[PDB]
Amino acid sequence: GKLLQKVKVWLQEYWNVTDLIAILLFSVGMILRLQDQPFRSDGRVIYCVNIIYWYIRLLDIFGVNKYLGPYVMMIGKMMIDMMYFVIIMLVVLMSFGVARQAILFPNEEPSWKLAKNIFYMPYWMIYGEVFADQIDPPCGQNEIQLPPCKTGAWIVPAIMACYLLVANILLVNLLIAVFNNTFFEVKSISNQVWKFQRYQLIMTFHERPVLPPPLIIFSHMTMIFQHLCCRWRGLKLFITDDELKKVHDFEEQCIEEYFREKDDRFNSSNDERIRVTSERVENMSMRLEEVNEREHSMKASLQTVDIRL
Amino acid sequence: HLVRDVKKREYPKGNLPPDYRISLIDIGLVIEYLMGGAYRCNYTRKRFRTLYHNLFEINHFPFPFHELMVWAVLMKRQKMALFFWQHGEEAMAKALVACKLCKAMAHEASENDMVDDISQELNHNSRDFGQLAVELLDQSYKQDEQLAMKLLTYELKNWSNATCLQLAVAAKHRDFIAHTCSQMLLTDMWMGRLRMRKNSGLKVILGILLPPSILSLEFKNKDDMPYMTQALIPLGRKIYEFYNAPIVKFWFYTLAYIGYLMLFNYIVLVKMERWPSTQEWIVISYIFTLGIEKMREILMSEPGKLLQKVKVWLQEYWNVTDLIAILLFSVGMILRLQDQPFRSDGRVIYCVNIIYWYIRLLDIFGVNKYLGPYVMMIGKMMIDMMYFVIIMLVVLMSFGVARQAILFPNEEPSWKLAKNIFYMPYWMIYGEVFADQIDPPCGQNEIQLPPCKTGAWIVPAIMACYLLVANILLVNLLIAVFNNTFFEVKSISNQVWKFQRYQLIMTFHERPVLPPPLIIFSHMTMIFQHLCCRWRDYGLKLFITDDELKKVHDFEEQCIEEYFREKDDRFNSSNDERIRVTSERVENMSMRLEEVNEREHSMKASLQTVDIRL
Ligand SMILES: CC(C)CCC[C@@H](C)[C@H]1CC[C@H]2[C@@H]3CC=C4C[C@@H](OC(=O)CCC(=O)O)CC[C@]4(C)[C@H]3CC[C@]12C
Ligand SMILES: CC(C)CCC[C@@H](C)[C@H]1CC[C@H]2[C@@H]3CC=C4C[C@@H](OC(=O)CCC(=O)O)CC[C@]4(C)[C@H]3CC[C@]12C
Numbered sequence: 062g063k064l065l066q067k068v069k070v071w072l073q074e075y076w077n078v079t080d081l082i083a084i085l086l087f088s089v090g091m092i093l094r095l096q097d098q099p100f101r102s103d104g105r106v107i108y109c110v111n112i113i114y115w116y117i118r119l120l121d122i123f124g125v126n127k128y129l130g131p132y133v134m135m136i137g138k139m140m141i142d143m144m145y146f147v148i149i150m151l152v153v154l155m156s157f158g159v160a161r162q163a164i165l166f167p168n169e170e171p172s173w174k175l176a177k178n179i180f181y182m183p184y185w186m187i188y189g190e191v192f193a194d195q196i197d198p199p200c201g202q203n204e205i206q207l208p209p210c211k212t213g214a215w216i217v218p219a220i221m222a223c224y225l226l227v228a229n230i231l232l233v234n235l236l237i238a239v240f241n242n243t244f245f246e247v248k249s250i251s252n253q254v255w256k257f258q259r260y261q262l263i264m265t266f267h268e269r270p271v272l273p274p275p276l277i278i279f280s281h282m283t284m285i286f287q288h289l290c291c292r293w294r295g296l297k298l299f300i301t302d303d304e305l306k307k308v309h310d311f312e313e314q315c316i317e318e319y320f321r322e323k324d325d326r327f328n329s330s331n332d333e334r335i336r337v338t339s340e341r342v343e344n345m346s347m348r349l350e351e352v353n354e355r356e357h358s359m360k361a362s363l364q365t366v367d368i369r370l
Numbered sequence: 371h372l373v374r375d376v377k378k379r380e381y382p383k384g385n386l387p388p389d390y391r392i393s394l395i396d397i398g399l400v401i402e403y404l405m406g407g408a409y410r411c412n413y414t415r416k417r418f419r420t421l422y423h424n425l426f427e428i429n430h431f432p433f434p435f436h437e438l439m440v441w442a443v444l445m446k447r448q449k450m451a452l453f454f455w456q457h458g459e460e461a462m463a464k465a466l467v468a469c470k471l472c473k474a475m476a477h478e479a480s481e482n483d484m485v486d487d488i489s490q491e492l493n494h495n496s497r498d499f500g501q502l503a504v505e506l507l508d509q510s511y512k513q514d515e516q517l518a519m520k521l522l523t524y525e526l527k528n529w530s531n532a533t534c535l536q537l538a539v540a541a542k543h544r545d546f547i548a549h550t551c552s553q554m555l556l557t558d559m560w561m562g563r564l565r566m567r568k569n570s571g572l573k574v575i576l577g578i579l580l581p582p583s584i585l586s587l588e589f590k591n592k593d594d595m596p597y598m599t600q601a602l603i604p605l606g607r608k609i610y611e612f613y614n615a616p617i618v619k620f621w622f623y624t625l626a627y628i629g630y631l632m633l634f635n636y637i638v639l640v641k642m643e644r645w646p647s648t649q650e651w652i653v654i655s656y657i658f659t660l661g662i663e664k665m666r667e668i669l670m671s672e673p674g675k676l677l678q679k680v681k682v683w684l685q686e687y688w689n690v691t692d693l694i695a696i697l698l699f700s701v702g703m704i705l706r707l708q709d710q711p712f713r714s715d716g717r718v719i720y721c722v723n724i725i726y727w728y729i730r731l732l733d734i735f736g737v738n739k740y741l742g743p744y745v746m747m748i749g750k751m752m753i754d755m756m757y758f759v760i761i762m763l764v765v766l767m768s769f770g771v772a773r774q775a776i777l778f779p780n781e782e783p784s785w786k787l788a789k790n791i792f793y794m795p796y797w798m799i800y801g802e803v804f805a806d807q808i809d810p811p812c813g814q815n816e817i818q819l820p821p822c823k824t825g826a827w828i829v830p831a832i833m834a835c836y837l838l839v840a841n842i843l844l845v846n847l848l849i850a851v852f853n854n855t856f857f858e859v860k861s862i863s864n865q866v867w868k869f870q871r872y873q874l875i876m877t878f879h880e881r882p883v884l885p886p887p888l889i890i891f892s893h894m895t896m897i898f899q900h901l902c903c904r905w906r907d908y909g910l911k912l913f914i915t916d917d918e919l920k921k922v923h924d925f926e927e928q929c930i931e932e933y934f935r936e937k938d939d940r941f942n943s944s945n946d947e948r949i950r951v952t953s954e955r956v957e958n959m960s961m962r963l964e965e966v967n968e969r970e971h972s973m974k975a976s977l978q979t980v981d982i983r984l
């Protein structure tokens with residue numbers, strides 16, 4: 062009932078929140094694109110990043126298909142482990158990047174292009190680009206005359222060797238191991254979660270109107286109009302009291318059957334049988350010890366009675 | 371043999387004369403050696419040795435079961451060592467000390483190369499005292515938890531005024547430390563005299579960045595249990611309590627270490643001038659001031675002899691690579707203050723230091739609950755990676771030499787040859803193929819190309835075989851090695867990470883207040899207090915009262931007969947022992963009920979004979 066609690070409930074679904082953000086960005090892009098050049102092209106830029114978002118949202122649309130849904134949930138779960146990977150990738154990538162920029166270009170004034178130079182080539186080394194010409198550029202020889210070699214420029218092959226070995230061979234393989242050791246647990250969690258979130262989809266598309274979004278302005282103005290003039294003008298079965306009495310009766314049968322069914326599994330479980338046999342047999346020894354002593358007394362009495370006759 | 375080893379080590383005979391009645395004093399000396407550290411055995415305190423020598427009432431040592439726990443362990447008498455352990459007091463100390471003595475006699479017996487069954491069974495006995503310690507600790511957690519905190523962090527006066535935590539880490543007794551009682555105990559030392567515990571970590575950084583937010587933080591209650599070493603105005607003491615807490619001093623060294631990093635990547639990108647820049651003076655400060663801190667950790671170590679203190683420092687793998695890079699940056703600092711060409715060299719020496727201080731962030735990231743295990747993951751993987759690299763190195767050279775021969779047949783001796791062996795095939799395993807240099811066309815009008823050096827119809831083949839062996843075969847193995855070792859490496863190195871939480875705690879609690887740039891002021895107070903009081907202890911204990919001593923004992927013996935009670939009762943109601951008991955009883959039922967029917971054979975004839983008589 063409170064507006065802030067409405068905003069919280071609408072903040073629960075994250076996809077809806079990113080819908081609101083991207084709709085706001087497309088409005089900003091409309092503003093700039095319907096504004097004069099040079100603001101036109103920036104509106105087209107904003108349209109491009111919105112295209113990116115609307116494209117991704119097809120993964121949320123790819124949920125009904127019973128296999129594709131838990132795959133989307135799989136890539137959502139593997140996000141956190143990629144984060145771990147991403148932090149360490151930064152550390153190592155930033156290491157070779159700063160070292161490479163500090164050797165290959167010694168004399169440089171401060172500028173933000175330095176950051177792009179550090180993060181440029183090291184990052185694309187991960188995806189198969191060694192940058193073969195700039196691995197060890199030939200220097201100091203003559204063929205013209207080659208420019209002079211920087212002091213200790215043979216460091217850059219060796220450090221880029223160790224960075225490539227740590228990146229492509231250790232860390233990617235370790236993320237292979239991470240994703241492969243967490244697959245099974247994420248199967249069980251995610252197929253249960255897809256069957257759970259199916260409910261939220263069920264009830265949302267029940268309350269959703271008939272008309273598609275291009276034509277939903279009609280159904281919205283109809284609904285707002287009919288509610289405001291109707292000021293002057295779940296999917297429960299609402300089952301009546303007879304069947305309601307039968308569903309109570311049915312439920313009482315299920316309750317009694319489960320309770321005495323777990324009792325019969327409790328007794329027929331073999332540790333129950335063995336425990337019984339144990340205490341019973343113990344009572345047997347006590348009884349038959351009494352039987353044997355009393356029988357000895359009875360045999361003595363019978364011997365005396367036969368001595369009488 | 372132990373007596374022979376350390377009496378000859380201390381008192382400098384031969385094979386020790388067997389008539390030597392080994393003193394209780396010398397038995398005190400063997401306990402101190404097998405402990406290591408600063409464990410001073412009750413026998414070797416000066417009062418016990420003066421009482422010994424004056425005699426050669428107080429003959430009955432006040433707590434006899436403790437001296438018989440040692441008597442037994444030293445004699446490898448395991449059935450009596452468990453016997454003495456049940457009937458007694460401070461049993462958490464008794465089992466954790468005996469876990470340490472056992473492990474210690476184990477590596478000694480293999481060091482002298484005695485009978486291997488002694489060294490073997492001493493590992494198993496050290497485990498046997500081990501699990502009884504952690505099962506007794508688990509059951510102290512089952513009862514009142516707050517009493518069980520005071521049991522461990524109790525000052526174990528008979529066991530050299532130690533703590534059960536101090537003892538268990540020295541015992542390397544992992545699942546003691548990883549237990550839930552000791553973890554949230556170490557969390558209590560970590561937050562220090564604060565409370566919070568609600569997405570913490572952020573507001574402690576906000577306390578440092580914004581000093582006035584210190585007032586809003588809910589500090590820990592006035593008594594609570596302040597774990598402590600050798601034992602307007604409230605706003606100033608609350609300033610002190612925040613700026614002495616171990617999580618505070620960690621994040622304040624962490625902002626100092628990120629802060630140093632932001633200044634030592636800037637000075638190496640931008641050109642250095644003849645006199646060092648103001649940024650680089652801050653850099654030159656931070657390394658040297660941290661060098662004074664690093665040598666202080668060596669100087670204030672727990673052992674006495676300086677070579678032994680250096681050995682304990684050498685155990686900390688990370689702290690030695692700090693010293694190597696402090697010295698390395700100092701050599702590059704001298705060359706930087708010199709002119710060309712040493713000036714250009716000193717920049718490159720700085721460039722090599724750039725990598726290590728980046729790598730020194732990995733451990734700092736090792737504090738986190740998930741990144742901490744992840745750093746420990748990578749360290750166990752690289753023993754497997756070295757193997758991978760050796761098999762790499764055979765096959766890589768395989769193509770590297772066999773191409774340098776074919777492509778360049780006529781070359782003189784030069785070190786350029788060994789470069790071109792290793793250069794090009796090693797850059798192939800990361801994606802490149804060097805496509806034009808695979809099979810360049812030769813001896814054909816294009817201008818007639820230079821002649822095909824004979825054998826160049828083979829170097830495509832041996833490279834193609836090299837790419838399948840390198841990029842495919844081994845790479846798939848290092849995948850299969852990694853995937854089938856991650857299971858054991860994860861489950862161990864979580865508990866390893868919970869073990870190194872202890873070490874981190876003790877270190878930052880000893881670390882001074884001020885950051886490594888400003889730590890000269892906390893150093894100069896440390897030197898000044900040392901020198902003026904020369905002209906005029908590690909651990910976090912409670913030193914609780916004597917009436918609370920007996921109470922913490924009484925809790926503990928109720929834990930002792932509790933654990934021994936359901937240990938017996940789990941076995942009298944284990945499944946397989948019920949079957950055992952029934953197979954006995956019935957067995958008794960067979961001979962006894964054989965007797966009953968065979969004796970009522972006499973009674974059946976007795977009634978029938980009396981029927982004839984009647
Ligand atoms: C071409 C480039 C720029 C693509 C950028 C990739 C990311 C923008 C995408 C790729 C896969 C996406 C993930 C795929 C699966 C899921 C599970 C799914 O989670 C939910 O439905 C729960 C709530 C929510 O986060 O919406 C949607 C988010 C998430 C993490 C997605 C978040 C956005 C990700 C990381
Ligand atoms: C732990 C990680 C995050 C280390 C990352 C370090 C870099 C991201 C930072 C550290 C210091 C920064 C530099 C500090 C100061 C300047 C001057 C600055 O100069 C100007 O703004 C004037 C001209 C221009 O606009 O470039 C340009 C960015 C630059 C080189 C910065 C680029 C980015 C640097 C290298």
Ligand SMILES: CC(C)CCC[C@@H](C)[C@H]1CC[C@H]2[C@@H]3CC=C4C[C@@H](OC(=O)CCC(=O)O)CC[C@]4(C)[C@H]3CC[C@]12C
Binds near residue numbers: 147173
């Ligand atoms: C979870 C992951 C993605 C963390 C990564 C965050 C940062 C490491 C990234 C995110 C955006 C990056 C910035 C995006 C854009 C630029 C502008 C760029 O400027 C130039 O190249 C100047 C133009 C020129 O070349 O002259 C310098 C790098 C920098 C600051 C980047 C530095 C690194 C940043 C801060």
Ligand SMILES: CC(C)CCC[C@@H](C)[C@H]1CC[C@H]2[C@@H]3CC=C4C[C@@H](OC(=O)CCC(=O)O)CC[C@]4(C)[C@H]3CC[C@]12C
Binds near residue numbers: 153157223688749750
């Ligand atoms: C850009 C190039 C130069 C990359 C640099 C590679 C190495 C300098 C790095 C990569 C991964 C690092 C390792 C990552 C994790 C660990 C575990 C951890 O090990 C220990 O604490 C010692 C225990 C052990 O021997 O495993 C900290 C050091 C170590 C071995 C690191 C040592 C330095 C390594 C090998």
Ligand SMILES: CC(C)CCC[C@@H](C)[C@H]1CC[C@H]2[C@@H]3CC=C4C[C@@H](OC(=O)CCC(=O)O)CC[C@]4(C)[C@H]3CC[C@]12C
Binds near residue numbers: 214216218226763766
């Ligand atoms: C078995 C696998 C996993 C590791 C083996 C790789 C390294 C042993 C090799 C591969 C490439 C080699 C580098 C290739 C080129 C050079 C440049 C070389 O310097 C020069 O030739 C001077 C500069 C010039 O002449 O242009 C010094 C050796 C070095 C760093 C080499 C050192 C050894 C490296 C790193």
Ligand SMILES: CC(C)CCC[C@@H](C)[C@H]1CC[C@H]2[C@@H]3CC=C4C[C@@H](OC(=O)CCC(=O)O)CC[C@]4(C)[C@H]3CC[C@]12C
Binds near residue numbers: 783
């Ligand atoms: C099975 C694996 C481990 C064996 C690998 C051995 C080769 C790769 C090495 C071992 C000794 C090396 C040689 C040792 C010394 C020299 C002299 C060296 O001479 C110069 O650099 C200049 C000579 C001059 O001053 O005239 C040229 C490289 C060469 C032939 C080396 C080439 C490479 C060799 C054969």
Ligand SMILES: CC(C)CCC[C@@H](C)[C@H]1CC[C@H]2[C@@H]3CC=C4C[C@@H](OC(=O)CCC(=O)O)CC[C@]4(C)[C@H]3CC[C@]12C
Binds near residue numbers: 789792
């Ligand atoms: C087992 C793993 C860890 C790798 C094994 C290490 C070696 C295979 C590396 C380490 C240092 C390397 C050497 C470092 C420097 C040089 C000098 C380099 O000489 C030149 O490049 C001369 C200049 C020119 O090319 O004209 C030739 C390669 C060589 C011998 C490298 C050969 C390969 C070495 C011995």
Ligand SMILES: CC(C)CCC[C@@H](C)[C@H]1CC[C@H]2[C@@H]3CC=C4C[C@@H](OC(=O)CCC(=O)O)CC[C@]4(C)[C@H]3CC[C@]12C
Binds near residue numbers: 826830
């Ligand atoms: C994944 C499995 C099926 C491996 C498949 C690879 C082979 C079917 C191909 C790949 C590249 C081929 C090689 C590429 C180049 C040559 C050079 C060729 O010699 C010439 O053409 C004469 C002189 C010259 O130009 O080298 C002889 C065959 C050979 C070794 C080829 C033999 C067949 C190879 C090994």
Ligand SMILES: CCC1(c2ccccc2)C(=O)NCNC1=O
Binds near residue numbers: 626627660663730886
């Ligand atoms: C050099 C790294 C570091 C450090 C270590 C862990 C956390 C924060 C800082 C430091 O900068 N000063 C104190 N000793 C150190 O080893």
